[PDB]
């Protein structure tokens, strides 16, 4: 039996158009540890995204932070795309400035 990832997409600092920030995708609560995470800009994959070292919570479920530098604008749409063994199809969560 396995556990599907919870997914959060958000910025390091409050979003401020034209101002440099970090775009984060936090995946947590999953098992097993293998997981595929992309950050998207207007539907396209962002290259050279970094991530945290694999660790886990008290209930043994894993978590990872994926992140990249970005400068938000009003027109640019951002999202996270996640695949895991518990998922038949990749899950896309869109970035929303107040979530």
């Amino acid at each position: 039996i396995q556990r599907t990832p919870k997914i959060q997409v958000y910025s390091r600092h409050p979003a401020e158009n034209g101002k440099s920030n970090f775009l984060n995708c936090y995946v947590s609560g999953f098992h097993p540890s293998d997981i595929e995470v992309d950050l998207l800009k207007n539907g396209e994959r962002i290259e050279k995204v970094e991530h945290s070292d694999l660790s886990f919570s008290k209930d043994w479920s894993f978590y990872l932070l994926y992140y990249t530098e970005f400068t938000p604008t009003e027109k640019d749409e951002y999202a996270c795309r996640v695949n895991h063994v518990t998922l038949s199809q990749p899950k896309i969560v869109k970035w929303d400035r107040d979530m």
Binding site: K6, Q8, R12, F22, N24, Y26, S28, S52, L65, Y67
Partner: peptide
């Protein structure tokens, strides 16, 4: 209630 999440800083 969302899970507490790292900002990266």
């Amino acid at each position: 209630l969302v899970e507490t999440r790292p900002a990266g800083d």
